[PDB]
Amino acid sequence: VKVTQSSRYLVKRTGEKVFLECVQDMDHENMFWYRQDPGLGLRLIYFSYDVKMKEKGDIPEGYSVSREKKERFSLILESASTNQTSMYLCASSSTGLPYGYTFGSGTRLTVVEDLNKVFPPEVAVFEPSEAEISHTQKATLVCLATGFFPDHVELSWWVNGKEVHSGVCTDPQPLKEQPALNDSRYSLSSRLRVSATFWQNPRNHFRCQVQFYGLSENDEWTQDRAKPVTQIVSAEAWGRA
Amino acid sequence: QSVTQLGSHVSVSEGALVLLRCNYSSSVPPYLFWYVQYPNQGLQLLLKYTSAATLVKGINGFEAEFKKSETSFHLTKPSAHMSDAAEYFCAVSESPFGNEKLTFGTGTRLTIIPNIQNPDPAVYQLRDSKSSDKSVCLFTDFDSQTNVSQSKDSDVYITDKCVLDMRSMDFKSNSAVAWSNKSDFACANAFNNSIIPEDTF
Protein backbone atom coordinates (compact mmCIF):
# COMPACT_ATOMS: atom_id res chain seq x y z
CA VAL A 1 0.00 0.00 0.00
CA LYS A 2 2.14 2.83 -1.35
CA VAL A 3 1.45 5.54 -3.86
CA THR A 4 4.79 6.88 -4.88
CA GLN A 5 5.54 9.90 -7.03
CA SER A 6 8.78 9.97 -8.99
CA SER A 7 10.23 13.03 -7.29
CA ARG A 8 9.71 15.08 -4.09
CA TYR A 9 10.86 18.48 -5.41
CA LEU A 10 11.62 19.72 -8.91
CA VAL A 11 12.93 22.91 -10.51
CA LYS A 12 12.02 23.90 -14.10
CA ARG A 13 12.07 26.89 -16.51
CA THR A 14 9.37 28.96 -18.21
CA GLY A 15 8.09 27.67 -21.57
CA GLU A 16 9.28 24.16 -20.90
CA LYS A 17 7.21 20.96 -21.22
CA VAL A 18 7.34 18.94 -17.95
CA PHE A 19 6.55 15.32 -16.93
CA LEU A 20 5.52 13.85 -13.51
CA GLU A 21 5.03 10.20 -12.59
CA CYS A 22 2.93 8.31 -10.10
CA VAL A 23 2.97 4.62 -9.26
CA GLN A 24 0.79 2.31 -7.18
CA ASP A 25 1.10 -1.24 -5.94
CA MET A 26 -2.60 -1.82 -5.30
CA ASP A 27 -3.99 -2.72 -8.77
CA HIS A 28 -6.12 0.43 -8.51
CA GLU A 29 -8.42 1.55 -11.36
CA ASN A 30 -8.49 5.13 -10.29
CA MET A 31 -5.71 7.69 -10.28
CA PHE A 32 -6.06 11.42 -9.72
CA TRP A 33 -3.65 14.33 -10.15
CA TYR A 34 -4.39 17.37 -7.97
CA ARG A 35 -2.50 20.52 -7.17
CA GLN A 36 -2.47 22.45 -3.94
CA ASP A 37 -2.11 26.16 -3.50
CA PRO A 38 -2.52 28.59 -0.64
CA GLY A 39 -6.16 29.60 -0.03
CA LEU A 40 -7.35 27.38 -2.96
CA GLY A 41 -7.11 24.00 -1.21
CA LEU A 42 -6.95 21.02 -3.55
CA ARG A 43 -8.02 21.20 -7.10
CA LEU A 44 -8.45 18.27 -9.44
CA ILE A 45 -6.50 18.67 -12.67
CA TYR A 46 -7.19 15.33 -14.37
CA PHE A 47 -8.28 11.79 -13.46
CA SER A 48 -8.34 8.24 -14.87
CA TYR A 49 -10.88 5.47 -14.00
CA ASP A 50 -9.05 2.77 -16.02
CA VAL A 51 -5.98 1.99 -18.12
CA LYS A 52 -5.83 4.14 -21.26
CA MET A 53 -8.65 6.37 -19.90
CA LYS A 54 -8.83 10.06 -18.86
CA GLU A 55 -11.33 12.78 -17.97
CA LYS A 56 -10.71 16.46 -17.32
CA GLY A 57 -10.85 17.78 -13.76
CA ASP A 58 -12.03 21.13 -12.45
CA ILE A 59 -8.89 22.83 -13.85
CA PRO A 60 -7.40 20.83 -16.78
CA GLU A 61 -6.11 23.91 -18.60
CA GLY A 62 -2.47 23.87 -19.69
CA TYR A 63 -2.27 20.24 -18.65
CA SER A 64 -2.22 16.99 -20.51
CA VAL A 65 -2.32 13.58 -18.95
CA SER A 66 -1.50 9.98 -19.78
CA ARG A 67 -2.47 6.56 -18.35
CA GLU A 68 -0.67 3.78 -20.18
CA LYS A 69 -0.29 0.88 -17.77
CA LYS A 70 -2.70 0.30 -14.89
CA GLU A 71 -0.14 1.04 -12.18
CA ARG A 72 1.11 4.52 -13.39
CA PHE A 73 -0.40 7.91 -14.26
CA SER A 74 1.55 10.79 -15.75
CA LEU A 75 0.99 14.51 -15.62
CA ILE A 76 2.40 16.69 -18.33
CA LEU A 77 2.59 20.47 -18.24
CA GLU A 78 2.10 21.81 -21.72
CA SER A 79 4.37 24.82 -21.17
CA ALA A 80 5.51 25.85 -17.69
CA SER A 81 4.79 29.28 -16.28
CA THR A 82 4.88 30.68 -12.74
CA ASN A 83 1.13 30.02 -12.18
CA GLN A 84 1.85 26.28 -12.53
CA THR A 85 4.32 26.46 -9.61
CA SER A 86 2.59 24.38 -7.00
CA MET A 87 2.44 21.26 -4.89
CA TYR A 88 1.38 18.34 -7.08
CA LEU A 89 -0.52 15.58 -5.42
CA CYS A 90 -1.23 12.14 -6.88
CA ALA A 91 -3.82 9.77 -5.47
CA SER A 92 -5.20 6.36 -6.32
CA SER A 93 -8.25 4.35 -5.29
CA SER A 94 -10.22 1.25 -6.28
CA THR A 95 -13.83 1.13 -7.23
CA GLY A 96 -14.57 -2.13 -5.40
CA LEU A 97 -12.41 -1.87 -2.27
CA PRO A 98 -13.99 0.18 0.56
CA TYR A 99 -10.93 2.17 1.43
CA GLY A 100 -11.14 5.48 -0.41
CA TYR A 101 -8.08 7.32 -1.58
CA THR A 102 -4.52 6.76 -0.89
CA PHE A 103 -2.40 9.85 -1.46
CA GLY A 104 1.22 9.98 -2.33
CA SER A 105 3.41 12.55 -0.64
CA GLY A 106 3.75 15.11 -3.37
CA THR A 107 6.19 16.96 -5.56
CA ARG A 108 6.84 20.69 -5.32
CA LEU A 109 7.40 22.25 -8.72
CA THR A 110 8.71 25.77 -8.90
CA VAL A 111 9.02 27.46 -12.32
CA VAL A 112 11.19 30.48 -13.04
CA GLU A 113 11.98 32.67 -16.03
CA ASP A 114 15.78 32.63 -15.70
CA LEU A 115 17.78 29.56 -14.61
CA ASN A 116 20.85 31.49 -13.33
CA LYS A 117 18.64 32.61 -10.41
CA VAL A 118 18.94 29.28 -8.45
CA PHE A 119 21.35 28.97 -5.51
CA PRO A 120 22.14 26.67 -2.62
CA PRO A 121 21.98 27.86 0.99
CA GLU A 122 25.06 28.67 3.11
CA VAL A 123 24.55 27.42 6.63
CA ALA A 124 25.73 28.61 10.06
CA VAL A 125 25.23 27.73 13.70
CA PHE A 126 25.49 30.33 16.44
CA GLU A 127 26.39 29.40 19.94
CA PRO A 128 24.33 30.00 23.02
CA SER A 129 24.61 33.33 24.81
CA GLU A 130 26.34 32.86 28.16
CA ALA A 131 23.72 35.38 29.36
CA GLU A 132 20.95 32.96 28.56
CA ILE A 133 22.80 30.19 30.30
CA SER A 134 23.40 32.35 33.35
CA HIS A 135 19.88 33.68 33.51
CA THR A 136 17.85 30.61 32.53
CA GLN A 137 20.22 27.62 32.68
CA LYS A 138 19.20 26.64 29.12
CA ALA A 139 21.16 26.97 25.95
CA THR A 140 19.70 27.89 22.59
CA LEU A 141 21.75 27.31 19.51
CA VAL A 142 20.56 29.09 16.38
CA CYS A 143 20.88 27.71 12.86
CA LEU A 144 20.78 29.99 9.86
CA ALA A 145 20.40 29.25 6.16
CA THR A 146 20.90 32.00 3.58
CA GLY A 147 21.21 32.69 -0.12
CA PHE A 148 18.90 29.96 -1.42
CA PHE A 149 16.60 29.62 -4.37
CA PRO A 150 14.10 28.33 -4.87
CA ASP A 151 12.29 27.92 -1.55
CA HIS A 152 13.32 24.23 -1.35
CA VAL A 153 15.00 23.41 2.01
CA GLU A 154 14.56 20.86 4.85
CA LEU A 155 16.50 21.65 7.96
CA SER A 156 17.14 19.13 10.75
CA TRP A 157 19.19 18.98 13.95
CA TRP A 158 21.23 15.97 15.06
CA VAL A 159 22.61 15.57 18.59
CA ASN A 160 25.44 13.04 18.73
CA GLY A 161 24.61 11.79 15.22
CA LYS A 162 20.98 11.13 16.16
CA GLU A 163 18.08 13.28 14.85
CA VAL A 164 16.10 15.25 17.47
CA HIS A 165 12.48 16.37 17.47
CA SER A 166 12.55 17.89 20.98
CA GLY A 167 13.64 21.44 21.99
CA VAL A 168 13.46 22.39 18.23
CA CYS A 169 11.50 24.89 16.06
CA THR A 170 11.98 26.38 12.61
CA ASP A 171 10.43 29.29 10.74
CA PRO A 172 7.15 28.04 9.21
CA GLN A 173 8.10 30.19 6.24
CA PRO A 174 11.29 31.78 4.88
CA LEU A 175 11.78 35.53 4.27
CA LYS A 176 12.94 37.66 1.35
CA GLU A 177 16.54 38.93 1.59
CA GLN A 178 15.77 41.60 -1.06
CA PRO A 179 11.92 41.94 -0.98
CA ALA A 180 11.58 44.34 -3.95
CA LEU A 181 13.28 41.94 -6.39
CA ASN A 182 10.87 39.76 -8.32
CA ASP A 183 13.05 36.66 -7.84
CA SER A 184 14.69 37.53 -4.46
CA ARG A 185 16.66 34.89 -2.56
CA TYR A 186 15.44 33.42 0.73
CA SER A 187 16.51 32.93 4.34
CA LEU A 188 15.31 30.49 7.04
CA SER A 189 16.23 30.10 10.74
CA SER A 190 15.96 27.32 13.25
CA ARG A 191 16.38 26.92 16.99
CA LEU A 192 17.59 24.05 19.14
CA ARG A 193 17.48 24.48 22.90
CA VAL A 194 18.97 22.19 25.53
CA SER A 195 19.77 22.25 29.23
CA ALA A 196 22.86 24.30 29.95
CA THR A 197 24.50 21.17 31.44
CA PHE A 198 24.15 19.27 28.17
CA TRP A 199 25.65 22.21 26.26
CA GLN A 200 28.45 22.23 28.79
CA ASN A 201 29.54 18.72 28.00
CA PRO A 202 32.13 18.73 25.19
CA ARG A 203 31.35 15.09 24.47
CA ASN A 204 28.11 16.32 22.88
CA HIS A 205 27.95 17.08 19.13
CA PHE A 206 25.29 19.36 17.66
CA ARG A 207 24.91 19.48 13.86
CA CYS A 208 22.54 21.65 11.86
CA GLN A 209 21.64 19.78 8.68
CA VAL A 210 19.96 21.52 5.75
CA GLN A 211 18.82 19.52 2.75
CA PHE A 212 18.39 21.54 -0.45
CA TYR A 213 16.61 20.47 -3.67
CA GLY A 214 17.82 22.28 -6.72
CA LEU A 215 18.90 21.15 -10.20
CA SER A 216 19.31 17.57 -11.33
CA GLU A 217 22.25 16.04 -13.12
CA ASN A 218 20.36 16.40 -16.47
CA ASP A 219 20.03 20.23 -16.39
CA GLU A 220 22.73 22.46 -17.90
CA TRP A 221 24.65 25.60 -17.21
CA THR A 222 28.13 27.12 -17.52
CA GLN A 223 28.09 29.83 -14.91
CA ASP A 224 31.36 29.87 -12.95
CA ARG A 225 29.40 28.80 -9.80
CA ALA A 226 28.99 25.14 -8.79
CA LYS A 227 25.92 23.49 -10.26
CA PRO A 228 23.25 24.16 -7.59
CA VAL A 229 22.12 20.58 -7.36
CA THR A 230 20.31 18.72 -4.64
CA GLN A 231 22.66 18.48 -1.69
CA ILE A 232 22.92 18.57 2.11
CA VAL A 233 24.68 21.63 3.55
CA SER A 234 25.40 21.30 7.28
CA ALA A 235 27.08 23.16 10.11
CA GLU A 236 28.46 21.81 13.37
CA ALA A 237 29.14 22.62 17.05
CA TRP A 238 30.74 20.96 20.12
CA GLY A 239 29.56 21.23 23.75
CA ARG A 240 31.50 23.62 25.97
CA ALA A 241 33.28 24.07 29.32
CA GLN B 1 -20.66 18.10 -6.01
CA SER B 2 -19.36 21.16 -3.98
CA VAL B 3 -17.67 22.14 -0.67
CA THR B 4 -16.59 25.29 1.19
CA GLN B 5 -14.64 25.95 4.38
CA LEU B 6 -15.32 29.40 5.82
CA GLY B 7 -12.20 30.66 7.54
CA SER B 8 -8.93 29.63 5.97
CA HIS B 9 -6.80 30.44 9.08
CA VAL B 10 -7.80 29.63 12.74
CA SER B 11 -5.49 30.51 15.66
CA VAL B 12 -6.55 29.23 19.14
CA SER B 13 -4.98 28.88 22.55
CA GLU B 14 -3.72 25.60 23.87
CA GLY B 15 -6.65 23.85 25.53
CA ALA B 16 -9.24 26.06 23.88
CA LEU B 17 -12.01 24.82 21.61
CA VAL B 18 -11.28 23.91 17.96
CA LEU B 19 -13.99 24.52 15.29
CA LEU B 20 -13.25 24.19 11.54
CA ARG B 21 -16.19 24.94 9.28
CA CYS B 22 -17.45 22.77 6.46
CA ASN B 23 -20.64 23.03 4.39
CA TYR B 24 -21.52 21.16 1.20
CA SER B 25 -23.84 20.93 -1.81
CA SER B 26 -24.72 17.86 -3.65
CA SER B 27 -27.35 16.92 -6.22
CA VAL B 28 -26.94 13.31 -4.99
CA PRO B 29 -26.78 11.69 -1.54
CA PRO B 30 -23.57 13.08 -0.04
CA TYR B 31 -20.73 11.46 1.92
CA LEU B 32 -18.11 13.49 3.81
CA PHE B 33 -14.56 13.15 5.07
CA TRP B 34 -11.95 15.23 6.82
CA TYR B 35 -8.26 15.09 6.05
CA VAL B 36 -5.25 16.59 7.89
CA GLN B 37 -1.89 17.63 6.43
CA TYR B 38 1.31 18.25 8.36
CA PRO B 39 4.84 19.23 7.34
CA ASN B 40 4.63 15.55 6.15
CA GLN B 41 3.55 16.30 2.63
CA GLY B 42 0.54 14.05 2.07
CA LEU B 43 -2.97 14.27 3.44
CA GLN B 44 -4.37 11.71 5.85
CA LEU B 45 -7.89 10.56 6.80
CA LEU B 46 -8.93 12.24 10.05
CA LEU B 47 -12.48 10.94 9.87
CA LYS B 48 -15.34 9.84 7.65
CA TYR B 49 -18.74 8.29 7.70
CA THR B 50 -21.02 5.50 6.67
CA SER B 51 -24.58 6.48 7.61
CA ALA B 52 -24.48 4.32 10.73
CA ALA B 53 -24.69 7.56 12.77
CA THR B 54 -24.62 11.29 12.79
CA LEU B 55 -22.04 12.25 15.44
CA VAL B 56 -18.69 10.86 14.24
CA LYS B 57 -15.44 10.48 16.16
CA GLY B 58 -12.17 10.84 14.27
CA ILE B 59 -8.50 10.31 15.10
CA ASN B 60 -6.50 12.68 17.32
CA GLY B 61 -9.47 13.43 19.58
CA PHE B 62 -11.67 15.11 16.86
CA GLU B 63 -15.42 15.06 16.14
CA ALA B 64 -17.97 16.16 13.52
CA GLU B 65 -21.76 16.08 13.30
CA PHE B 66 -23.44 15.47 9.97
CA LYS B 67 -26.33 17.97 10.19
CA LYS B 68 -28.23 17.39 6.91
CA SER B 69 -30.73 20.02 7.97
CA GLU B 70 -27.84 22.53 7.90
CA THR B 71 -25.88 21.10 4.96
CA SER B 72 -22.77 21.02 7.32
CA PHE B 73 -20.11 18.69 8.74
CA HIS B 74 -18.16 20.96 11.10
CA LEU B 75 -15.05 19.55 12.71
CA THR B 76 -14.47 20.03 16.51
CA LYS B 77 -12.24 19.01 19.37
CA PRO B 78 -12.97 20.26 22.88
CA SER B 79 -9.45 21.15 23.83
CA ALA B 80 -6.60 22.05 21.53
CA HIS B 81 -3.24 20.39 21.63
CA MET B 82 -0.03 21.73 20.16
CA SER B 83 0.27 18.84 17.74
CA ASP B 84 -3.11 19.68 16.26
CA ALA B 85 -1.32 22.48 14.41
CA ALA B 86 -1.83 21.51 10.85
CA GLU B 87 -3.85 22.01 7.74
CA TYR B 88 -7.36 20.43 7.51
CA PHE B 89 -9.56 19.57 4.46
CA CYS B 90 -13.20 18.73 4.23
CA ALA B 91 -14.24 16.56 1.27
CA VAL B 92 -17.45 15.30 -0.34
CA SER B 93 -17.94 12.19 -2.56
CA GLU B 94 -20.68 10.41 -4.43
CA SER B 95 -19.32 7.06 -3.17
CA PRO B 96 -19.90 6.06 0.45
CA PHE B 97 -16.30 4.86 0.67
CA GLY B 98 -14.83 7.99 -1.03
CA ASN B 99 -13.57 5.82 -3.89
CA GLU B 100 -14.90 7.93 -6.75
CA LYS B 101 -13.79 11.51 -7.12
CA LEU B 102 -13.68 13.69 -4.02
CA THR B 103 -14.12 17.38 -4.19
CA PHE B 104 -12.01 19.18 -1.61
CA GLY B 105 -12.52 22.45 0.18
CA THR B 106 -10.03 25.35 0.23
CA GLY B 107 -8.63 24.10 3.56
CA THR B 108 -8.19 25.69 6.95
CA ARG B 109 -4.72 26.21 8.46
CA LEU B 110 -4.97 25.71 12.25
CA THR B 111 -2.53 27.52 14.53
CA ILE B 112 -2.36 26.82 18.26
CA ILE B 113 -1.02 29.50 20.53
CA PRO B 114 1.09 28.22 23.40
CA ASN B 115 0.29 29.15 27.01
CA ILE B 116 3.45 30.66 28.45
CA GLN B 117 3.13 30.45 32.20
CA ASN B 118 6.15 32.19 33.78
CA PRO B 119 7.45 34.37 30.98
CA ASP B 120 10.68 36.26 31.32
CA PRO B 121 11.48 37.87 28.02
CA ALA B 122 15.12 38.55 27.17
CA VAL B 123 17.22 39.50 24.09
CA TYR B 124 20.52 37.62 23.76
CA GLN B 125 23.35 38.09 21.29
CA LEU B 126 24.93 34.94 19.93
CA ARG B 127 27.81 34.32 17.55
CA ASP B 128 29.78 31.49 16.19
CA SER B 129 33.07 32.94 17.42
CA LYS B 130 34.65 31.64 14.16
CA SER B 131 31.88 32.92 11.93
CA SER B 132 33.77 35.88 10.40
CA ASP B 133 31.96 39.26 10.99
CA LYS B 134 28.63 37.54 11.58
CA SER B 135 26.49 37.15 14.74
CA VAL B 136 22.72 36.93 15.58
CA CYS B 137 20.11 38.21 18.06
CA LEU B 138 17.63 35.98 19.87
CA PHE B 139 14.47 37.42 21.41
CA THR B 140 12.95 34.58 23.52
CA ASP B 141 10.75 33.63 26.53
CA PHE B 142 7.99 36.14 25.82
CA ASP B 143 4.30 35.57 26.66
CA SER B 144 2.05 34.58 23.80
CA GLN B 145 0.53 38.14 24.01
CA THR B 146 3.69 39.52 22.32
CA ASN B 147 4.05 40.00 18.49
CA VAL B 148 7.23 40.75 16.42
CA SER B 149 7.10 43.49 13.73
CA GLN B 150 8.72 43.53 10.28
CA SER B 151 12.05 45.37 9.83
CA LYS B 152 12.47 49.01 8.77
CA ASP B 153 16.07 48.75 7.48
CA SER B 154 17.36 47.17 4.22
CA ASP B 155 20.10 45.29 6.12
CA VAL B 156 18.06 44.27 9.18
CA TYR B 157 16.32 40.87 8.78
CA ILE B 158 13.80 39.68 11.44
CA THR B 159 11.91 36.35 11.64
CA ASP B 160 8.45 35.77 13.16
CA LYS B 161 7.97 34.01 16.52
CA CYS B 162 8.16 30.22 16.64
CA VAL B 163 7.52 27.82 19.57
CA LEU B 164 9.70 24.97 20.83
CA ASP B 165 8.88 22.17 23.34
CA MET B 166 11.55 20.54 25.53
CA ARG B 167 9.25 17.65 26.43
CA SER B 168 11.78 16.25 28.93
CA MET B 169 11.18 19.47 30.96
CA ASP B 170 7.48 20.16 30.30
CA PHE B 171 8.79 23.48 29.02
CA LYS B 172 7.67 25.56 26.04
CA SER B 173 9.26 28.84 24.83
CA ASN B 174 8.62 31.28 21.98
CA SER B 175 11.56 32.75 20.10
CA ALA B 176 12.38 35.08 17.23
CA VAL B 177 15.64 35.72 15.39
CA ALA B 178 17.11 38.98 14.01
CA TRP B 179 20.37 39.88 12.22
CA SER B 180 22.13 42.41 10.00
CA ASN B 181 25.34 42.74 7.96
CA LYS B 182 25.52 46.42 8.91
CA SER B 183 28.25 46.50 11.58
CA ASP B 184 26.69 49.69 13.05
CA PHE B 185 23.82 47.68 14.58
CA ALA B 186 23.44 45.75 17.83
CA CYS B 187 20.84 43.56 19.45
CA ALA B 188 20.09 46.42 21.87
CA ASN B 189 17.95 48.02 19.16
CA ALA B 190 16.62 45.54 16.64
CA PHE B 191 13.21 44.77 18.11
CA ASN B 192 11.33 48.04 18.88
CA ASN B 193 7.67 47.13 18.74
CA SER B 194 5.25 45.41 21.09
CA ILE B 195 8.32 45.12 23.41
CA ILE B 196 8.17 45.21 27.26
CA PRO B 197 10.05 47.30 29.90
CA GLU B 198 10.94 44.04 31.69
CA ASP B 199 13.56 42.76 29.15
CA THR B 200 16.98 41.32 30.07
CA PHE B 201 20.06 42.17 27.96
Author numbering:
A (entry chain B): 2 to 242
B (entry chain A): 1 to 201
What do the study authors state?
The key molecular interface that enables T-cells to sense these threats is mediated by the clonally expressed T cell receptor (TCR) that classically distinguishes between self and foreign peptides. The TCR governs T-cell specificity by discriminating between self and foreign peptides presented by MHC molecules. One key feature that is likely to facilitate this level of cross-reactivity is flexibility within the TCR complementarity-determining region loops (CDR loops) that form the antigen contact zone.
For the HA1.7 TCR, we observed a larger shift in potential positions for the Cα backbone of the CDR3α loop, differing by up to 5 Å. In contrast, the HA1.7 TCR structures, in which a large loop movement was observed, were solved at 2.5 Å average resolution. Similarly, the HA1.7 TCR CDR3α loop was free from crystal lattice contacts and shifted between structures. Thus, we conclude that these loop movements represent real differences in the conformation of the CDR loops of the HA1.7 and F11 TCRs due to the intrinsic flexibility of these regions. Although this analysis is an approximation and should be treated as such, the average maximal loop motion was slightly less (6.4 Å) for the 003 TCR compared to F11 (8.7 Å) and HA1.7 (9.0 Å), consistent with the structural data demonstrating greater rigidity in the 003 TCR.
